[PDB]
Amino acid sequence: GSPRESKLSKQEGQNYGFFLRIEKDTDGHLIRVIEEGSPAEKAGLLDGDRVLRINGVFVDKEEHAQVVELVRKSGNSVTLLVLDGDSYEKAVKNQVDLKELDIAACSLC
């Protein structure tokens, strides 16, 4: 499956509505527990998605704290490039260069 670009917006007094996790023996910055009615929910985030980029910044190899800090530094809007859990785990298995993944697609019909 393709990565997706999710554009989240929130107000002061709100959160985006998900947890970012590192899990034992699991690769990637994991999105977990999408809160009902949240910006994350509205923006198409899914449990098990990995965050590849935050506002264009490649974060797959960054430490958890630095990924969370980039979210904080983004303020009340943030663009996430995410990849679903199955596609991410297949990509790592297949030695796909995650840095080259982009949403741009174009086919002639």
Residue numbers in the entry: 5 to 113
From the paper:
PDZK1 is a multi-PDZ domain-containing adaptor protein known to play a role in the expression, localization and function of several cell surface receptors and ion channels. PDZK1 is a multi-PDZ domain containing protein, possessing four PDZ domains. PDZK1 was recently identified as a novel direct interactant of the IP and this interaction was determined to involve a Class I ‘PDZ ligand’ (Ser/Thr–X–Ф–COOH, where X represents any amino acid and Ф represents a hydrophobic amino acid) located at the extreme carboxyl terminus (-SLC386) of the human (h) IP. Prostacyclin primarily acts through the prostacyclin receptor or, in short, the IP, a member of the GPCR superfamily.
We grew crystals, collected X-ray diffraction data at the NSLS (Brookhaven National Laboratory) and solved the crystal structure at 1.70 Å resolution by molecular replacement using the coordinates of the crystal structure of the first PDZ domain of PDZK1 bound to the SR-BI carboxy-terminus as the search model. The high quality of the electron density map permitted unequivocal assignment of all amino acid side chains. Fig. 4B shows that in the crystal, the IP peptide (yellow) of one molecule (B) interacts with the peptide binding pocket of the PDZ domain (green) of an adjacent molecule (A) in the asymmetric unit, resulting in an “infinite chain” of head-to-tail molecules. As has been described for target peptide binding to other PDZ domains, the C-terminus of IP (−6IAACSLC 0) inserts into a groove formed between the β2 strand and the α2 helix, and the CBL formed by 14Lys… 20Tyr-21Gly-22Phe-23Phe-24Leu that connects the β1 and β2 strands. The backbone amides and carbonyls of the target peptide form classic anti-parallel β-sheet hydrogen bonding interactions beginning with carbonyl of 22Phe of the CBL and extending through β2 from 23Phe to 26Ile. The carboxylate group of the target peptide’s 0Cys makes hydrogen bonds with the amide nitrogens of 20Tyr, 21Gly and 22Phe in the CBL and, through water-mediated interactions, the carbonyls of 75Val and 76Arg of α2 and the carbonyl of 79Gly. 68His (α2), which did not participate in the SR-BI/PDZ1 interaction appears to play an important role in the IP/PDZ1 interaction, forming an hydrogen bond with the side chain of −2Ser. The crystal structure described herein, analyzing the interaction between the carboxy-terminus of the IP and PDZ1 highlights the plasticity of a given PDZ domain to interact with the carboxy-termini of binding targets with very different amino acid compositions: -IAACSLC for IP versus -VLQEAKL for SR-BI. The structure also highlights the importance of the last three carboxy-terminal amino acids of IP, responsible for the majority of hydrogen bonds formation and hydrophobic interactions between IP and PDZ1, a function that could not be assumed by a farnesyl group.
